[PDB]
Design a protein around this motif. Structure first.
Motif, PDB file in Angstrom:
ATOM      1  N   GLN A  81      54.659  31.965 120.740  1.00  0.00           N
ATOM      2  CA  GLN A  81      53.248  31.900 120.358  1.00  0.00           C
ATOM      3  C   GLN A  81      52.338  31.870 121.582  1.00  0.00           C
ATOM      4  OE1 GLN A  81      54.068  32.642 116.762  1.00  0.00           O
ATOM      5  NE2 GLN A  81      51.945  32.126 117.264  1.00  0.00           N
ATOM      6  N   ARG A  91      45.896  39.231 129.235  1.00  0.00           N
ATOM      7  CA  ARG A  91      46.648  39.588 130.467  1.00  0.00           C
ATOM      8  C   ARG A  91      45.693  40.279 131.444  1.00  0.00           C
ATOM      9  NH1 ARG A  91      52.256  42.574 129.587  1.00  0.00           N
ATOM     10  NH2 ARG A  91      52.646  40.330 129.426  1.00  0.00           N
ATOM     11  N   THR A 103      45.887  45.910 135.006  1.00  0.00           N
ATOM     12  CA  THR A 103      46.723  46.431 136.072  1.00  0.00           C
ATOM     13  C   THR A 103      45.862  47.126 137.120  1.00  0.00           C
ATOM     14  OG1 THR A 103      47.100  48.571 135.008  1.00  0.00           O
ATOM     15  CG2 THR A 103      48.550  46.763 134.397  1.00  0.00           C
ATOM     16  N   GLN A 152      46.171  50.289 138.240  1.00  0.00           N
ATOM     17  CA  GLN A 152      45.765  51.607 137.767  1.00  0.00           C
ATOM     18  C   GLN A 152      44.617  51.523 136.772  1.00  0.00           C
ATOM     19  OE1 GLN A 152      48.949  50.767 138.253  1.00  0.00           O
ATOM     20  NE2 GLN A 152      49.405  52.215 139.906  1.00  0.00           N
ATOM     21  N   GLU A 153      44.686  50.588 135.827  1.00  0.00           N
ATOM     22  CA  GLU A 153      43.605  50.388 134.872  1.00  0.00           C
ATOM     23  C   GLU A 153      42.309  49.974 135.548  1.00  0.00           C
ATOM     24  OE1 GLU A 153      44.527  47.790 131.537  1.00  0.00           O
ATOM     25  OE2 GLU A 153      46.326  48.976 131.117  1.00  0.00           O
ATOM     26  N   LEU A 181      48.413  29.151 142.361  1.00  0.00           N
ATOM     27  CA  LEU A 181      48.610  27.704 142.349  1.00  0.00           C
ATOM     28  C   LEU A 181      47.337  26.965 142.740  1.00  0.00           C
ATOM     29  CD1 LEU A 181      50.644  25.462 141.855  1.00  0.00           C
ATOM     30  CD2 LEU A 181      51.257  25.583 144.268  1.00  0.00           C
ATOM     31  N   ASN A 182      46.733  27.344 143.869  1.00  0.00           N
ATOM     32  CA  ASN A 182      45.528  26.661 144.331  1.00  0.00           C
ATOM     33  C   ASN A 182      44.369  26.847 143.362  1.00  0.00           C
ATOM     34  OD1 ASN A 182      47.132  26.152 146.562  1.00  0.00           O
ATOM     35  ND2 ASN A 182      46.211  27.786 147.792  1.00  0.00           N
ATOM     36  N   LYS A 214      60.270  27.878 130.659  1.00  0.00           N
ATOM     37  CA  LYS A 214      61.452  28.402 131.322  1.00  0.00           C
ATOM     38  C   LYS A 214      61.162  29.805 131.840  1.00  0.00           C
ATOM     39  CE  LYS A 214      65.079  28.126 128.710  1.00  0.00           C
ATOM     40  NZ  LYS A 214      64.689  27.311 127.527  1.00  0.00           N
ATOM     41  N   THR A 225      55.367  38.047 134.623  1.00  0.00           N
ATOM     42  CA  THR A 225      55.153  39.323 133.888  1.00  0.00           C
ATOM     43  C   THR A 225      53.841  39.340 133.096  1.00  0.00           C
ATOM     44  OG1 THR A 225      56.439  41.025 132.838  1.00  0.00           O
ATOM     45  CG2 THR A 225      56.145  39.022 131.553  1.00  0.00           C
ATOM     46  N   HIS A 262      50.579  40.593 136.776  1.00  0.00           N
ATOM     47  CA  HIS A 262      51.401  41.801 137.026  1.00  0.00           C
ATOM     48  C   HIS A 262      52.159  41.591 138.318  1.00  0.00           C
ATOM     49  CE1 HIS A 262      48.811  43.414 133.752  1.00  0.00           C
ATOM     50  NE2 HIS A 262      50.043  43.718 133.348  1.00  0.00           N
ATOM     51  N   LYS A 263      52.709  40.399 138.466  1.00  0.00           N
ATOM     52  CA  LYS A 263      53.391  40.029 139.714  1.00  0.00           C
ATOM     53  C   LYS A 263      54.856  39.764 139.433  1.00  0.00           C
ATOM     54  CE  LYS A 263      49.265  40.161 141.302  1.00  0.00           C
ATOM     55  NZ  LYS A 263      48.885  40.598 139.940  1.00  0.00           N
ATOM     56  N   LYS A 264      55.595  39.411 140.463  1.00  0.00           N
ATOM     57  CA  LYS A 264      57.015  39.120 140.331  1.00  0.00           C
ATOM     58  C   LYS A 264      57.282  37.673 139.952  1.00  0.00           C
ATOM     59  CE  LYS A 264      58.696  40.106 144.137  1.00  0.00           C
ATOM     60  NZ  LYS A 264      58.520  40.277 145.604  1.00  0.00           N
TER      61      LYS A 264
END
Lengths: 167, 47, 112, 295, 184, 82, 146
Positions: free
Chosen positions: A4, A13, A16, A18-19, A45-46, A90, A97, A100-102
RNA sequence: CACAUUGCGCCCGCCGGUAUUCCGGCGGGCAUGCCUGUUCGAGCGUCAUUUCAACCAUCAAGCCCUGGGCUUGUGUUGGGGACCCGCGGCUGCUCGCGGGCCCUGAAAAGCAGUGGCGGGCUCGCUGGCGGGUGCCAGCCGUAAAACCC
């Protein structure tokens, strides 16, 4: 509850690259030949810590697997002190995701559109109750201590070798 | 009876909370080896 | 310096040379063993052949009886009155697949 | 690597980037053109147009077969569509140049032999039915063969049209193909013994006749006007069978007009074999067909 | 393992299906189609898992039992009723001559003795049909295109067309023709 | 604010959390090589205030150095030797 | 032999007899099940009672599905202790709660004729009622005839 | 690679000798540590993955006194409040059907009561018949019909 969360969140989100370039080209062409404030998931984080301290965050999600842990080890306590609902997810790759990062150590929801105010409020209530009540029951205590058969057998071996006769 | 009921209930609870999804020696695997494709010749004219 | 923005439908609707341009003869390499052409059609492929080529019903039964892939010659001529009766060959794709497999797997050796 | 990164994007949810990367991947499933460019391998394998015409036998055999065959995973529907355009296009080149020489009817199909620039080129066409596929016939391999031969005929027909003077590609009408033109959908523009056998004749094809075999034969040997039933397809000179300006028509059934010549298709094939009109009385309907001879 | 999420999802799906079936029953003949004797090609595609009883009976009658399967049907008023009843699970439109040629010649089959034999010979064509004057497969194409007196037994001869999944591709009119190039 | 939170948490070293983390890492680094590369700073706030950036060009190396003396005392530290 | 009774509240629209039975029988074995509904109109009060054969199984079910988010509804699954389980609690268990068009019934009732001699002793009763209306209407001051 | 002997190995290409197999020569290359970036991998290191979407008339048909209007299509979470009414039963008290006003998060703690038709299950009698059934993700509103086959 994780599903949810990511349903309301996937609507907010980030854009991106390109967008974003395509949009910027669209207004550039329009000026060649007046918008509302964007709403998105706030990460970093900051930045998220600043939003928590200023009480602009409505919801906070913290990845469980940030190493080093010190980066987040205070975040649940900070959220509890400031009164913002928080939860632990988790997978830093999954929070990652949405943006748009790792990897995202933390993500937060500040404000949503009128079409999703009720959904965000209900998600906040659901996460608050169904997670924070159980966490309040068991968060103040020590963890660990999952000794199995081999570990306990080694424990009786150690005690029967130690306290019987000599030290 | 009772043990079977408890095991089936525990399996159902686990599925509800977490979903339905959950020679011997080691050698270096043979990986891909790229041949040299240089961006510039090291020496312009051969000797 | 950069193209102007184009709507996605216009982009969707929007989106040869003489290959023998510099052609010169080249000596044939002696390692090249090309595939010889298939044998030319005979007088037995015709669906309406001379009656001399019409075979016996008994050998036809034997040919239909014995299991596939063991003949000297892989069909039997049959007389049909017209293309209405002439049926589509059932093993055409199989034969051409075997021919292609002969191209890319059959060893080629020059023999005198 | 591109496929791996597309999988990354799909598993990550970036559908727009995945779609962009699949255009960059240039998938034949949508493009219809082959996975890889093959110009250099054509160049170094076939040094001359003579050798190209010499292997045109197998090239045409495969592209005709896969223009007739149903759509599969290795060879998709639009790849077969491009095969069909290119094969009917080569049939136009033969029709215009009158390069077709001999034809043959066999239990294995219809053989066509032509002479282009002194090279004899053959190809076999299966009968218009459901070619039944049996056994371990993996379509990836002859799919690669199909890609190879599609590039081959693309370049060969380009060269042939540049040599004859006609333009490439021919103007093809999608709407007319939808109304079923097959060979009739191409309008061939230009750039700015064989043709007499049926030239002074008008033909009609019935529902029972082999449409494109008869059409190709008569176009290749001169006949400029055939009518046919509407179900057969568009492009018929005269759709009405009651039309009186008809000389010859094919009947292959078990208004009986006086000024009229009923012939069986074997008459057309043995005529194109023998370079001379065969007796309509000896090839009249309801009679034991005279034997066919291989050319 | 099945989830309450699903259970509720199908409950509301069947609730809406019951509502819509009553609505047609009340407004018998809702589909405002002019009276023309034409042909409709219908393809069963994936839809709701639990099909209601009357739609299941109609699908069994139309022989659209498996997924992704197309058949030809004469456009009558009862035909329109059943098609617009079974609309959610099927995609239906008007065929084209090139399209029907492609389907019958590439994916055409026939039902003989309850067995599927590929349309390989006009001899089998006169063996099954022909008593009504169907001599060849393209005679069959002719009657299918220009629907004749014998469409019912013609369709009974035609075993439903098993298509392939769309490789990168209500009443769709001529767009179902693009769909069937995409699926054929 | 995470940088000050980490600065205070590093100031309080014998606190339970930092002691536990230092024990596990001390074990991990003993299992690892004497000199090895780091990936990410285990003390990002200290690295940042000393001048570390997350740019292509900055790297971390963890080095183990034996402690003690030569009664002679080495004028250079164990930090300089590392 | 200790049956266990669980109360589920905040029921999403559709999580009715059959879905509840299937879900909680996939968890275990149900003796009885009943969603509460209104007699006037066939609508549920969004709550149900399930008596499981095994009290332990009921307990795990309540723990696992107490605070569940289903279609924007945080469920409330709690075991009721056997002390206050009212003996007449599962009275409409396992039956069919049917919908009765009481409005149509009253309407057919208004249209069915009868010998209106009783309706004329009833019009004597309505003459006494409009006398009541008149006596309450005297403070108004409005006079109306019959 | 080798106290470096003008010796000996691997990859790619070429040349001269009868040369597609042999010989010899020639040219470009093959050290380690480390950084950035590629590509190929490995890990009982972590994670996700049995999909809570949209999908009613964004207008139609019949009409009238010819140009505007009408009819139709029927689609609502639940609970609570010494509040104001109408109508049907109740000897009456009252209870139902519909309203008027107010409140509550998509809130919640027995209160379940109206007669039937099909069909399922079950018991008896001579496949048939008669009985029951807190059973029907079927209908229906007195009887009974329709689906059903």
């Amino acid at each position: 509850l994780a599903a949810q969360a990511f349903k309301l969140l996937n609507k907010y989100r980030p854009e991106t690259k390109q967008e974003k370039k395509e949009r910027l080209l669209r207004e550039a062409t329009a000026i060649k030949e007046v918008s509302k404030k964007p709403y998105t998931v706030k990460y970093g984080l900051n930045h998220v810590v600043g939003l928590i301290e200023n009480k602009k965050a409505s919801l906070v999600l913290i990845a469980n697997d940030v190493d080093p842990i010190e980066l987040v080890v205070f975040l649940p306590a900070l959220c509890r002190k400031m009164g913002i609902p928080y939860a632990i997810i988790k997978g830093k790759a999954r929070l990652g995701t949405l943006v748009h990062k790792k990897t995202a150590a933390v993500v937060a929801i500040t404000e949503v559109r009128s079409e999703d105010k009720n959904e965000l409020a209900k998600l906040i209530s659901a996460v608050k109750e169904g997670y924070l009540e159980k966490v309040e029951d068991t968060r103040k205590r020590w963890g660990g201590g999952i000794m199995g058969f081999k570990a306990q057998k080694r424990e009786e071996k150690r005690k029967k070798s130690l306290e019987t006769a000599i030290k | 009876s009772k043990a079977a009921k408890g095991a089936q209930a525990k399996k159902a609870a686990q599925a509800a909370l977490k979903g339905v999804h959950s020679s011997t020696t080691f050698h270096r695997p043979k990986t891909l080896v790229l041949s040299r494709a240089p961006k510039y010749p090291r020496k312009s004219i051969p000797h | 310096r950069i193209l102007p923005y184009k709507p996605p439908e216009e982009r969707e609707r929007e989106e040869f040379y003489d290959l023998w341009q510099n052609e010169e003869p080249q000596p044939p390499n002696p390692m090249h063993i090309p595939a010889p052409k298939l044998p030319p059609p005979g007088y037995d492929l015709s669906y309406n052949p001379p009656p001399e080529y019409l075979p016996t019903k008994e050998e036809r039964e034997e040919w239909e009886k014995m299991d596939p892939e063991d003949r000297e010659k892989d069909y039997l001529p049959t007389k049909y009155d017209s293309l209405r009766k002439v049926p589509a060959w059932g093993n055409f794709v199989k034969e051409r697949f075997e021919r292609c497999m002969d191209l890319y797997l059959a060893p080629r050796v020059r023999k005198n | 690597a591109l496929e791996k990164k597309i999988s990354r994007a799909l598993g990550r949810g970036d559908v727009s980037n995945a779609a962009r990367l699949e255009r960059n991947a240039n998938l034949p499933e949508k493009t219809g053109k082959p996975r890889y460019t093959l110009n250099h391998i054509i160049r170094e394998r076939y040094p001359t147009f003579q050798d190209a015409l010499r292997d045109l036998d197998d090239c045409l055999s495969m592209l005709f077969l896969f223009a007739n065959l149903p759509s599969t995973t290795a060879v998709p529907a639009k790849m077969i569509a491009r095969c069909e355009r290119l094969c009917h296009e080569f049939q136009h080149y033969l029709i215009v140049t009158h390069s077709l020489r001999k034809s043959f009817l066999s239990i294995k199909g219809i053989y066509y032999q032509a002479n282009i620039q002194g090279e004899d080129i053959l190809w076999l066409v299966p009968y218009k039915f459901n070619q039944r596929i049996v056994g371990d016939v993996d379509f990836r391999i002859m799919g690669t063969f199909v890609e190879f031969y599609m590039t081959l005929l693309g370049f060969v027909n380009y060269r042939l049209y540049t040599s004859i003077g006609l333009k490439y590609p021919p103007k093809f009408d999608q709407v007319k193909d939808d109304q079923g033109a097959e060979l009739a959908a191409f309008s061939l523009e230009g750039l700015n013994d064989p043709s007499q056998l049926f030239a002074n004749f008008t033909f009609f094809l019935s529902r029972e006749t082999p449409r494109q075999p008869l059409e190709f034969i008569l176009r290749a040997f001169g006949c400029k006007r055939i009518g046919w039933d509407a179900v057969l397809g568009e492009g018929a000179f005269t759709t009405d069978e009651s039309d009186p300006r008809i000389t010859h028509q094919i009947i292959d059934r078990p208004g009986r007009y006086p000024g009229r010549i009923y012939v069986q298709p074997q008459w057309v094939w043995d005529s194109i074999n023998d370079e001379e009109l065969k007796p309509p009385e000896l090839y009249a309907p309801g009679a034991q067909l005279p034997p066919h001879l291989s050319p | 393992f099945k989830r309450a999420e699903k259970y509720v999802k199908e409950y509301r799906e069947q609730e809406r299906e019951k509502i819509r079936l009553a609505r047609i029953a009340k407004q018998q003949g809702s589909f405002h189609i002019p009276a023309e004797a034409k042909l409709v090609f219908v393809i069963r595609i994936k839809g709701i898992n639990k099909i209601p009883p009357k739609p299941r009976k109609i699908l069994q009658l139309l022989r659209l039992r498996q997924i992704n399967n197309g058949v030809f049907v004469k456009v009558t008023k009862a035909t329109a009723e059943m098609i617009k009843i079974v609309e959610p699970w099927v995609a239906y439109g008007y065929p084209n001559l090139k399209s029907v040629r492609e389907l019958i010649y590439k994916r055409g089959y026939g039902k003989v003795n309850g067995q599927r034999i590929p349309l390989t010979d006009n001899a089998i064509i006169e063996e099954n049909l022909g008593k009504y004057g169907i001599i060849c497969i393209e005679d069959l194409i002719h009657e299918i295109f220009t629907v004749g007196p014998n469409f019912k037994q013609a369709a009974n001869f035609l075993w439903p067309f098993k298509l392939s999944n769309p490789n990168g591709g209500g009443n769709r009119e001529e767009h179902i023709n693009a769909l069937i190039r995409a699926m054929n | 604010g995470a940088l000050k939170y980490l600065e205070e948490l590093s100031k309080k070293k014998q606190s339970d959390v930092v002691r536990f983390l230092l024990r596990v890492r001390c074990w991990e680094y003993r299992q690892l090589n004497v000199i090895h590369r780091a990936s990410r700073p285990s003390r990002p706030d200290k690295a940042r205030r000393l001048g570390y950036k997350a740019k292509q060009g900055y790297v971390i190396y963890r080095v183990r150095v034996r402690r003690g003396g030569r009664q002679l005392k080495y004028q250079r530290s164990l930090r300089a030797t590392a | 032999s200790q049956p266990g009774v669980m109360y589920i509240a905040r029921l999403p629209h559709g999580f009715y007899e059959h879905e509840l039975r299937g879900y909680f029988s996939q968890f275990g074995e149900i003796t009885r099940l009943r969603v509460v509904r209104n007699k006037k109109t066939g609508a549920s009060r969004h709550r149900a009672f399930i008596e499981f054969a095994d009290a332990e199984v009921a307990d795990i079910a309540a723990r696992t599905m107490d605070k569940y988010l289903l279609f924007g509804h945080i469920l409330t699954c709690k075991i009721v202790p056997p002390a206050q389980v009212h003996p007449d609690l599962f009275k409409g268990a396992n039956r069919r709660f049917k919908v009765v068009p009481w409005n149509k019934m009253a309407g057919r009732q208004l249209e069915r004729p009868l010998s209106e001699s009783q309706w004329q002793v009833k019009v004597a009763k309505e003459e006494q009622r409009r006398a009541a209306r008149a006596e309450k209407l005297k403070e108004m001051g409005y006079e109306f005839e019959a």
